[PDB]
Amino acid sequence: GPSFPEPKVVRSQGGLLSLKLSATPTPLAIAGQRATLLTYGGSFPGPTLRVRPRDTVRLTLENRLPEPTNLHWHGLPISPKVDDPFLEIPPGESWTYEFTVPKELAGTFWYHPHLHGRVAPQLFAGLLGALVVESSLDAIPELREAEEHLLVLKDLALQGGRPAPHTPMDWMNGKEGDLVLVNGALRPTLVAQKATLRLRLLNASNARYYRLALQDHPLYLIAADGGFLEEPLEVSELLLAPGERAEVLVRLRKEGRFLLQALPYDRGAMGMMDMGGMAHAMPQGPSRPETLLYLIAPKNPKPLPLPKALSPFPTLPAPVVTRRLVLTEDMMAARFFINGQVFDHRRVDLKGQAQTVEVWEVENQGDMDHPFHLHVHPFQVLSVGGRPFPYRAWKDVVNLKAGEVARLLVPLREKGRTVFHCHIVEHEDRGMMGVLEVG
């Protein structure tokens, strides 16, 4: 096979992507071992769905798990009557998701379960896949001539040939695994054939963060979670929190082997210690550095010039309301709150008007990083921690370190009831989620 493993791609045909996917326990070879994972389409990751704006997607999910499940079309600005976070597909039953891809949309999105209280074990076990929305911008020479790859960043831990069970501490921190994988492979080698790479990045992990750095190279950010930037932005490193996506250009500078690493990062996970009276919580501190993949540059690399522009960001109407959403923790109880409450599917927390813009101030009063996600309505991050964001682009997850406030500009799109929640999915399952109704 190709030196670099990537999920199989399913493309729309004549403007229609019609596909039946089963969610099923699947024996497979993983990182050199045999294991049974929970998969979509018999693979880990699940297949990459590749579509264009205005395509129709018709996805019939068959549930062959011993528990109920459903799908969240993460990042897609479609109707919550389709992307329905309250729907339950019982074991043995099927459901068809049908929607049209929005006209003004591009980038890397993904699908995974969202059945409250069951998300963390289902996602950890292997249920996720990517969805790419191809754009006319992809035809510009500086992108067309680049070598494109998808990198699905997901870790895993195995026990007795199955995903390791969640411990109480896992419910508190979010579960991370020792197998730090790219596209389900352990430290694959990417032998580049072109001097410019276009990499679509997805953090599909439950809780692990990826502080991305390529040895000896900067990255050029060209897209965030939900669309292009207005122009490329040079960065020395790039933090991807759970649920986030990015697209970067890599401009290979000379021949050789360069490691793509997840550098040490302290997200505030906790351990427990007993030192003589003690028996209390202690910081785990920064993650150990991980090598994600080996990048081999071609001979005499001569990278393309960067595109001068990408996509102009929409001029939004003035906002008509400001919201404040405060995140707090009860670590020893593994309970997590928004404005002092846990999720209740029957309770509407915010009520907004479609086609107006809101300002959401999300404040992390906990000690852990929390990556805040809103369904259905992509947002523009204005600032985090009082620092203005250095680009304009659509996002749907925003990471908050301890104490930080994120200010978001949130245009409300499709009508209906939807949710916002922490994308450390253990925290969502344990209560850190609320209901937004748009009318």
Q: Which residue has the tokens 């003690």?
A: 278
**Residue 256: CB atoms within 10 Å:** 12
**Residue window 342-381: x/- pattern of binding to Cu ion, with contact defined by CB under 5 A:** ----------------------------x-----------
**Residue 352: CB atoms within 10 Å:** 19
Neighbouring-strand partners of residue 10 = 49
Is 427 a binder of Cu ion (CB under 5 A)?
Answer: yes
Whether 280 has a binding-site annotation, put simply, is yes
What does the alpha-carbon distance between residue 209 and residue 397 come to, in Å, rounded to a whole number?
13
Q: Is 168 exposed, middle or buried (0-12, 13-18, 19+ CB in 10 A)?
A: exposed
Is 316 a binder of its own copies (CB under 8 A)?
Answer: no
* Coil, strand or helix at 420: strand
Whether 377 has a binding-site annotation, put simply, is no
- Of 161 and 317, CB closest to its own copies: 317
Is 243 a binder of Cu ion (CB under 5 A)?
Answer: yes
Pseudo-torsion of CA 82, 88, 94, 100, nearest 10°?
A: 10
- Of 158 and 223, CB closest to Cu ion: 223
The least CB distance from residue 264 to ligand [O-], in Å, is 26
**Residue window 322-351: x/- pattern of binding to its own copies, with contact defined by CB under 8 A:** x-----------------------------
For residues 396-435, which are near ligand [O-] according to CB under 6 A? 423
Strands 107-112 and 72-74: antiparallel
How many chain residues bind Cu ion (CB under 5 A)?
A: 8
Backbone angles phi, psi at 170, to 5 degrees: -60, -40
Q: Which of 288, 223, 218 is nearest to 258 (CA)?
A: 218
Neighbouring-strand partners of residue 182 = 153, 185
Is 373 a binder of ligand [O-] (CB under 6 A)?
Answer: yes
* Coil, strand or helix at 302: coil
- Of 200 and 373, CB closest to ligand [O-]: 373
Mark 405-427 as b/e (b = at least 16 C-beta within 10 Å): bbbbbbbbbbbbbbbbbbbbbbb
208 contact, one of its own copies, Cu ion, ligand [O-], none, CB 5-8 Å limit per kind: none
Whether 72 has a binding-site annotation, put simply, is yes
- The continuous run of DSSP H or E covering 171 comes out as helix 168-173
Q: Which stretch binds its own copies (CB under 8 A): 60-68, 234-242, 318-326, 365-373?
A: 318-326
424 contact, one of Cu ion, ligand [O-], its own copies, none, CB 5-8 Å limit per kind: Cu ion
Whether 375 has a binding-site annotation, put simply, is yes
Is residue 237 within 8 Å of 211, Cβ to Cβ? yes
Whether 423 has a binding-site annotation, put simply, is yes
Which one of 52, 114, 154, 407 is in contact with ligand [O-] (CB under 6 A)?
114
Question: What stretches of 52-191 adopt beta strand conformation (E)?
Answer: 56-63, 72-74, 94-100, 107-112, 129-133, 147-156, 158-159, 162-163, 179-182, 185-186, 189-191
- Of 198 and 375, CB closest to ligand [O-]: 375
Is 321 a binder of its own copies (CB under 8 A)?
Answer: yes
- Of 128 and 156, CB closest to ligand [O-]: 128
- Of 52 and 114, CB closest to ligand [O-]: 114
Whether 427 has a binding-site annotation, put simply, is yes
What is the per-residue DSSP string for 110-126? Answer: EEE---TTSHHHHHHTT
Backbone angles phi, psi at 137, to 5 degrees: -65, -20
Is 320 a binder of its own copies (CB under 8 A)?
Answer: yes
Whether 345 has a binding-site annotation, put simply, is no
Q: Which residues bind ligand [O-] (CB under 6 A)?
A: 72, 74, 114, 373, 423
Binding-site entries for Cu(2+): 72, 74, 112, 114, 280, 370, 373, 375, 421-423, 427
Q: Which residues bind its own copies (CB under 8 A)?
A: 320-322
Q: Which residues bind Cu ion (CB under 5 A)?
A: 72, 74, 114, 243, 370, 422, 424, 427
